[PDB]
Amino acid sequence: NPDTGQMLGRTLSRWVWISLYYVAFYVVMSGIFALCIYVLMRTIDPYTPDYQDQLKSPGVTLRPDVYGEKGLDISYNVSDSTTWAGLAHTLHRFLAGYSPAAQEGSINCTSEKYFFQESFLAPNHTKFSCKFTADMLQNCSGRPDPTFGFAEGKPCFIIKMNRIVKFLPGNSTAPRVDCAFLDQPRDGPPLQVEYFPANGTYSLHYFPYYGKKAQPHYSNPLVAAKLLNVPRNRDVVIVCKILAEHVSFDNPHDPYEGKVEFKLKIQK
Amino acid sequence: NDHQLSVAELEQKYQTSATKGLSASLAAELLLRDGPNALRPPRGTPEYVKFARQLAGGLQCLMWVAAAICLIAFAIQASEGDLTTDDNLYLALALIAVVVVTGCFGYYQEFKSTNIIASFKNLVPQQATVIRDGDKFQINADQLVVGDLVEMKGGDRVPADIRILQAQGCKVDNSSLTGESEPQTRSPECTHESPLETRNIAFFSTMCLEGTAQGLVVNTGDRTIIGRIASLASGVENEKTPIAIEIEHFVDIIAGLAILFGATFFIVAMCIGYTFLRAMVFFMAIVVAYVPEGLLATVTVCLSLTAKRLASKNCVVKNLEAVETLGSTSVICSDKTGTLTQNRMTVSHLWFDNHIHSADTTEDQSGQTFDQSSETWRALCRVLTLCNRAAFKSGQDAVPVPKRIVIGDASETALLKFSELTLGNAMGYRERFPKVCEIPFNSTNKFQLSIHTLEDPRDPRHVLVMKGAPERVLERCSSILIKGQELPLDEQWREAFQTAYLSLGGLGERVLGFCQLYLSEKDYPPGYAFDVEAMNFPTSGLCFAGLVSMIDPPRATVPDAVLKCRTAGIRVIMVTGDHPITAKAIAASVGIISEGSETVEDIAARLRVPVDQVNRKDARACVINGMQLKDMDPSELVEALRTHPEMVFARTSPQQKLVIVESCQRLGAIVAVTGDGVNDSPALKKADIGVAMGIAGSDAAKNAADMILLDDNFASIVTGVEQGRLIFDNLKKSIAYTLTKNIPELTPYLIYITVSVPLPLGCITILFIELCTDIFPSVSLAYEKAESDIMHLRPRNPKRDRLVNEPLAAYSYFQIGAIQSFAGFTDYFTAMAQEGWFPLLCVGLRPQWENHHLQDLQDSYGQEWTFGQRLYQQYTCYTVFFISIEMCQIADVLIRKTRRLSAFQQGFFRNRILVIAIVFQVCIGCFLCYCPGMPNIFNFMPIRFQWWLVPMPFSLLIFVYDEIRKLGVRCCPGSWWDQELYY
């Protein structure tokens, strides 16, 4: 069939002709596809997404994030500093983005009320974003304790809510973090937590989030939960939920929606 | 052989006697040495073996290999610690399930056809009349041994191959074993050297029509002629069908394309940094992806629909592949006796009033009659009705006369049926003329005479009717009846009689002479005692009435069926065991030999020159007898077949029929064989498709054939040819439709691997497309009408015109499939961008997107997503790609209705099955999208309405582009556009 004069049942000039036809066909179709993409991108709004069909409720993440085989799993030895050195380093690296230098692009906020911005009054046609600094975490900021309570067996966990454009958690009261044992230990008391900021609330002036084009300097507000009565040498499960009117945490297919659940063991 | 021996040479070879036969003890010893006198039963194959066969085939093997590759890839991925490998299991299970269910459906089809065919076969134990050491008794035929002396009479089956020793007017029916339509005389004398033409051999399983015979068993069981034919058919191998060959060629195309694409993207994946094992998994995935899933089911359903259409016309196929072969058939080798003809001697021509009249010979009396007004005709009818002794069986009034059963020989049966169909009430007319004298037929006289009394009480005259061989009648009969005048034979009527007799005999017809002589009252008064012992009544000086000739006529639909087959470009060849004169006459009657066609013998007779002087290329027709065929080599046979378009093989053995079929197949033709008798079974097995008559067919022929005509309607062959051509075209369209959607199923995976976008199309939704939403629309294309006069086209070239070829594959894969892929990706990027993911961010996003440890991945707006939310977005992408493919497949099914004609020409809605299939597809898509629980069951999402709209311009583009392509094909035939863009 690969005859010299007729190469796979078609002469050389015929191959040129059919190849040119296929090239023209694919060039035309590629141009149509590119024009469709261009029209789509010209109809897309740069500040607000068209739909939020998958973002009805925000996800909840935890720092430091260490993952086992079914989710978050944190284990360390109080007597062994190398077991929590990496955890403290992760917390330091996360809080590096919350220094005053990192937060120079944001402003003082004191309203305790939704920061509704309908105009672009910030530098370079932007919106003001409120300033959150690591020192708002107090005993869990890495100062004066650079171990975040891990050395003393009272670890700090940073709970961060996923930001959604124009999502409003609820203005009756500030959204609040609540951490408890998933299954209460039998002989032991319930989990004792200390929160930074006090009561574990996110101020309402960090909402709404307007996206990264309108607030390029936006920083998620943080809540640090310091655990105080974790039993030693025992496997415990801790769930930290967000308590707000418009935040749900009962999704059987998303365990990170509205809450974060981690496995914790503190050896001695 | 044993016939060519003598009774002295016999009676010693078989340790027997001519008068007393065999001793009982020695007969028992012979029955121990050789098996019982019965043909060996076919061992057959078990039902599970037939099911295993149904699980085989080219496409089935491709699917089995694809499933094995899926399992191997699953094992490799599991060894590499990879998860989410349920796609491999789903694909393998779907492939295996489709193969097994299709095999079950095909096995059920074969089981039903076998039951339907065997519902007409019935068994009854046989018996023989044996003489052992003097005593005569009725023994079972199976206990007969060689050398046993047997006696047979009329109505008795011949119980073995027998050399005739005594016989008195013995006639047998050899029409099944041989091709001879007329009853054959059996006498104790050798008249030929071959056992199949000598008169002193009777054949096992044939019927003794009349007379008595005595003879010695010379062959038993499988040693008989019929047993040897059964052995010959057993050694014939059944070849693969043309549709199977087409399917294998198309499977080869798919395999080559799959290997090419897999190797190319394996190289690409290695070049872009994948590991060798990951690239190998990519290779196997692509190779599996090229294998279609529901195409086997679609093909099986289309073949089943064609089989049902044929079965509605009493045409039953034993396997689904046989519904196509007649469409591709270029040569039909047809048996004559019992297949083209009715296997029933019928009155055809009459010579009275110096004119040759033609009688209606159709079994349904749908032909033209002859003039029945002459007093000469009235006298001839009276003679031929009064000179008959055959009688209809009682309780048979409602049965049609040609199919009725009468007690008598073939000639008297035909005359009685002719009387019942022309005069009406033959026996009621006979009883009106009381018989007062009768001389039965005898070979010393070669005539039959009977004297009656006229019905009219006024007339006391006696009528003397006489019938017999024309020369014997004309040696008497010094007067002839022409237009009611009793003129004598002044040598003019003698020469005219000789001319008419010779012409009727040359028409392959057996002729009879009829006359009458009224007896005057003064010399033969009422109460006269006629005496056969003394011949007091006059036996000469009679009045000749007319000549009646007889033939086994063609079936009613046969000539038009042959004409239509020849109009469809199919060569029709007659292969018969009957005599050349009858074969040529029937071939001219049915249209195998056309008007004006001549043989070399015909040209030699016309030009008054020796036959060898004639140029062989001037003779369109040719008759070759088996004796010449024996002394012919393949080169001479091929030369004769190429030289003479209209070929008749006469006096042909079953082995020679097989040889002719093999020669035609070796020349490159797809050959169909039509037959009914045992002598056709080896040729029926060798044929690409074998067609056997349901009623006239023997068990061997019906077992050898692939197609059974239940009502013996030969015109069903025309329907088979038309339906085969139609199913070929419609299968081409359906396969194009099925193959088109495979490219938009595979391109998202290629982009997912190379550009690392989040997965646009899931395995479950691909399976739903393959096995749920498109099977009904693909099947609905089997209901498309022909776009041209399909029965005026020539048979396709088997080597050039393939079911799936390069233009079809290229068009379906890389133009329509490419447009569908572009539509799917447009919808994918639209749905991603409207939910917050711009295309450039989508590029390279896959590792972070699938990272289970990332619960705050940022989109184009800075919003942070969990893995579950991203997975639901991925399901949305699945759904929009699925809906794009479905919308474009609507236009694909619309444009696949025709290959040359416009949709406006063919009719948008004339295929209501296709319309229903489109509605059904849309309904299933809506159900999958919007039923509650779908996102977590099958990962279908309730997409927004505007994502239904996005692929619609692409579907419209598909329709418009295909319409323009077909317009260019129709407007510029033979151009480069027609050569390249038409399929």
Ligand SMILES: CCCCCCCC/C=C\CCCCCCCC(=O)OC[C@H](COP(=O)(O)OCC[N+](C)(C)C)OC(=O)CCCCCCC/C=C\CCCCCCCC
């Ligand atoms: C055998 C032949 C195969 C041929 C396949 C197609 C070849 C060409 C395809 C892709 C190459 C790029 C061509 C298209 C470019 C897009 C057209 C365009 O001008 O868009 C503009 C955007 C940039 O706009 P922006 O974001 O700044 O605006 C934001 C505006 N604000 C801020 C207001 C929201 O540019 C972009 O998106 C760039 C990203 C576009 C590409 C996305 C990834 C494509 C990858 C795979 C798809 C393959 C499909 C294959 C289907 C057929 C297979 C047979």
Ligand SMILES: CCCCCCCC/C=C\CCCCCCCC(=O)O[C@H](COC(=O)CCCCCCC/C=C/CCCCCCCC)COP(=O)(O)OCC[N+](C)(C)C
């Ligand atoms: C040929 C004959 C065809 C007859 C029609 C077939 C029956 C269709 C009738 C009803 C089925 C759909 C409506 C009931 C379910 C609503 C569920 C729902 O309401 O889910 C919403 C429907 O989304 C819509 O935008 C409305 C879509 C309405 C249906 C449009 C698609 C139907 C179009 C059919 C055209 C067929 C003819 C064209 C093709 C053939 C051409 C020849 C989805 O929720 P979402 O959009 O808010 O976002 C989701 C946010 N998340 C994720 C949080 C839930």
Ligand SMILES: CC(C)CCC[C@@H](C)[C@H]1CC[C@H]2[C@@H]3CC=C4C[C@@H](O)CC[C@]4(C)[C@H]3CC[C@]12C
């Ligand atoms: C060059 C750009 C525009 C893309 C290529 C356009 C293609 C489709 C066009 C441009 C030149 C055209 C060819 C010109 C020459 C020939 C040879 C002739 O015997 C048949 C038509 C044929 C085969 C044409 C087919 C279509 C063709 C190949």
Ligand SMILES: CNCc1ccc(OCc2ccccc2OCc2ccc(Cl)cc2)cc1
């Ligand atoms: C008509 N054929 C249908 C069809 C089309 C496109 C396909 O893409 C492959 C693919 C898509 C989506 C997810 C997973 C996929 O592959 C997984 C995989 C399969 C087999 C092997 Cl061996 C190894 C891996 C697959 C089947």
Ligand SMILES: *[C@@H]1O[C@H](CO)[C@@H](O)[C@H](O)[C@H]1NC(C)=O
């Ligand atoms: C924001 O408020 C804090 C606390 O009052 C203050 O220390 C800081 O200076 C303010 N931001 C500026 C001006 O950098």
Ligand SMILES: *[C@@H]1O[C@H](CO)[C@@H](O)[C@H](O)[C@H]1NC(C)=O
């Ligand atoms: C936090 O630190 C202060 C000292 O700055 C101390 O008084 C207080 O008890 C600490 N609380 C805890 C247990 O975090």
Ligand SMILES: *[C@@H]1O[C@H](CO)[C@@H](O)[C@H](O)[C@H]1NC(C)=O
């Ligand atoms: C780690 O914890 C175990 C108890 O689970 C303890 O026995 C061991 O001493 C600890 N490691 C060190 C370095 O002390």
Ligand SMILES: [Mg+2]
């Ligand atoms: Mg026959």
